[PDB]
Design a protein around this ligand. Structure first.
Ligand SMILES: Cc1cc2c(cc1C)N(C[C@H](O)[C@H](O)[C@H](O)COP(=O)(O)O)c1[nH]c(=O)[nH]c(=O)c1N2
Ligand SMILES: Cc1cc2c(cc1C)N(C[C@H](O)[C@H](O)[C@H](O)COP(=O)(O)O)c1[nH]c(=O)[nH]c(=O)c1N2
Ligand SMILES: O=c1ccc2cccc(O)c2o1
Ligand SMILES: O=c1ccc2cccc(O)c2o1
Lengths: 360, 360
């Protein structure tokens, strides 16, 4: 089975092609993770996936999505990850982390607590920052503060510090969160970036924050560990071919700047879009990016059907298949997939105290 | 759905009728549990089951099954359980523990490391104890040492100390392991107990170790927390009706001695048997014990098919359904069962960081 073939990138070898993508848990306190995250992540690692990427982890307090978001903006925050990293490694999975800044979509309620921008008089909320003072709209009506050049310098340095901390905590894989309408994506998109300085107003200028952040992170992140990013390559906003062309050009510049793999997503930059949700709907666009930028890719959305994951790999649409919600439903999805694809000794996807008893 | 109806026993309320029975992990070191057990148990608790019973935990070092078995024979061993108990409670499950002594089946290899008695010159092995110096046979050929009266007194006190420690660690449910051919079962069975003192040679004498241990434990175990036992009620050895009659009589004496619920199993006392394995095969015998001893019961083996669990409850064969291997396969089996039975808001079997996203 293609799904169960190992994958090597730089000095890291994944035991199969199943990746667990970053999935916010909304369970941290002042950015500090706790036993929610420890058990959640260690349990997923034991389920058999080759790569486990920790949820969007804020590089700065105002870059959290919500008051429950994880952070890595101090050394104390980083040290909270150390036992979790060690547990993921003990289980034979590769520990990764997505480092992030929510930009204009920050200061929001948890998804089951309204999912909307926090009220002005709520003691939990904060001022958001972005390339331009323009609200997302809809359920995120807060107008962000326009960043100064010093703010740009500071946020870049926060990404550097976050990457340094991730490295020293023992992560073996890093993902820069340049997708989903958050800070990086919003610098790239003309919808959200109306700047007329060096950071807006041409393709090179809109790309600049992302490319400078990548290059700065590359200085502290080991060359032998995968350096990756998540990026929304289209919006489904009626400007798809032009946007895809620009995104693919940026992907080529990421590759040239040392990016090892791209997690291909949708922008979610603005609310007025028409995204054609469906099982594996991103497959063809991930394949196009892979081919035209000549870069390994992953993608997600509806790949939790084992045969569909297998088909995407065999078609060379993807190098790794990211499976999110199916792992919330069943932490041992990789074992389910091994059985469903007829892999020999499928139960040994799991550790011995489980595998021995499940051999059928 | 019957499966998702709460259950109250003494002061404890279970959120549903799904019990996770004790399942040895073989991952402890010198009896001390570790992060294997922490993550395993906390993950299961979050999966939605109403009751989680920790694996057979030895009351004394020689009462382990294997060198990987958990123990509770010192206060340091007990304190290792405290964070796990707290994690199980945080998840809304009830923490229980099975306290045990393997008797003549002790000093064995892990199941994936031979499953047989440890060789005489292996530094990990030890002398086994039992009511009589008679080997199980087959893969367990070691002849145990015949217990003295002082050994009987000592082992009873070890059960008392284990129960006291379980109480003080915060467990809310205890199960005495009087099944599966281990020490207690072997005192009851004429196959293994050939004693001619007060502890063998009539029904009352063979029952004596079990009843005295129950009564001694009852002195330290809170009256407001369920006091339970697992007991093999037949062997499938060609003596089933006589054995069932005696076992039911003993169950009546357990009830009279304060037992709140009986986990009904098979003896496994000797190897030469013909057990009719099949899905829910224990249902009718559990029902007979329940009716004839007028005592709540659980049982296991093949109840991991949701409709079958539901049928057993609706037929009043069982009060709780124990589901073991299906939870090794999928820690979130309770969520799978809720979906499969059409329970309203099935995803909310799981905590919010999962449930919100799985609402269909
Ligand atoms: C609970 C939860 C939380 C998050 C997500 C999703 C879900 C369900 N997703 C998106 C996720 O990585 C994935 O792309 C989608 O869930 C689609 O994949 P599935 O269809 O779920 O396999 C996500 N994406 C991201 O880049 N960073 C994150 O931290 C989050 N947080
Ligand atoms: C890995 C493992 C380990 C154990 C068990 C089983 C398995 C699979 N079983 C028996 C278990 O509680 C249950 O009765 C059987 O597994 C049958 O139920 P299922 O068919 O698996 O749902 C078990 N029983 C017991 O009384 N104490 C224990 O510690 C163990 N250990
Ligand atoms: O990047 C993110 C962060 C949180 C999140 C939550 C749900 C769906 C998503 O796609 C998400 O994406
Ligand atoms: O009581 C026990 C202890 C370990 C064990 C293992 C497998 C099957 C069983 O029934 C078991 O029973």
């Amino acid at each position: 089975s293609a799904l169960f073939e190992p994958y090597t990138l730089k000095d890291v070898t994944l035991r199969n092609r199943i990746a667990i993508p970053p999935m916010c848990q909304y369970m941290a306190e002042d950015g500090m993770i706790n036993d929610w995250h420890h058990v959640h992540l260690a349990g997923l690692a034991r389920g058999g996936a080759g790569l486990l990427v920790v949820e969007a982890t804020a590089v700065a307090p105002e870059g959290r999505i919500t008051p429950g978001c994880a952070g890595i903006w101090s050394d104390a925050h980083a040290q909270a990850f150390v036992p979790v990293v060690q547990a993921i490694k003990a289980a034979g999975s590769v520990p990764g982390i997505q480092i992030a800044h929510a930009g204009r979509k920050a200061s929001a309620n948890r998804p089951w607590e309204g999912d909307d921008h926090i009220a002005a008089d709520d003691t939990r909320g904060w001022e958001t920052i972005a390339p331009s003072a323009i609200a997302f709209g809809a359920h995120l009506p807060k107008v962000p503060r326009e960043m100064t050049l010093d703010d740009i310098a500071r946020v870049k340095q926060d990404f550097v510090d976050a990457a340094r901390r991730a490295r020293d905590a023992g992560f073996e894989w890093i993902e820069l969160h340049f997708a989903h309408g958050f800070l990086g994506q919003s610098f790239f998109s003309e919808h959200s970036n109306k700047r007329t300085d060096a950071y807006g107003g041409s393709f090179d200028n809109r790309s600049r924050f992302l490319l400078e952040t990548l290059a700065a992170v590359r200085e502290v992140w080991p060359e032998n560990l995968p350096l990756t990013a998540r990026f929304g390559v289209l919006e489904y906003d009626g400007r798809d071919e032009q946007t895809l062309e620009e995104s693919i050009e940026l992907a080529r510049r990421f590759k040239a700047g040392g990016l090892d793999l791209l997690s291909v997503s949708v922008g979610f930059t603005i609310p007025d879009t028409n995204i054609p949700w469906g099982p594996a709907f991103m497959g063809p666009i991930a394949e196009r990016v892979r081919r035209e930028a000549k870069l390994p890719v992953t993608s997600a959305w509806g790949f939790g059907t084992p045969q569909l994951a297998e088909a995407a790999l065999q078609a060379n649409q993807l190098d790794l298949v990211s499976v999110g919600r199916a792992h919330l439903a069943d932490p041992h999805w990789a074992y389910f997939a091994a059985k469903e694809l007829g892999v020999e000794k499928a139960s040994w996807t799991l550790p011995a105290p489980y595998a021995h008893w499940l051999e059928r």
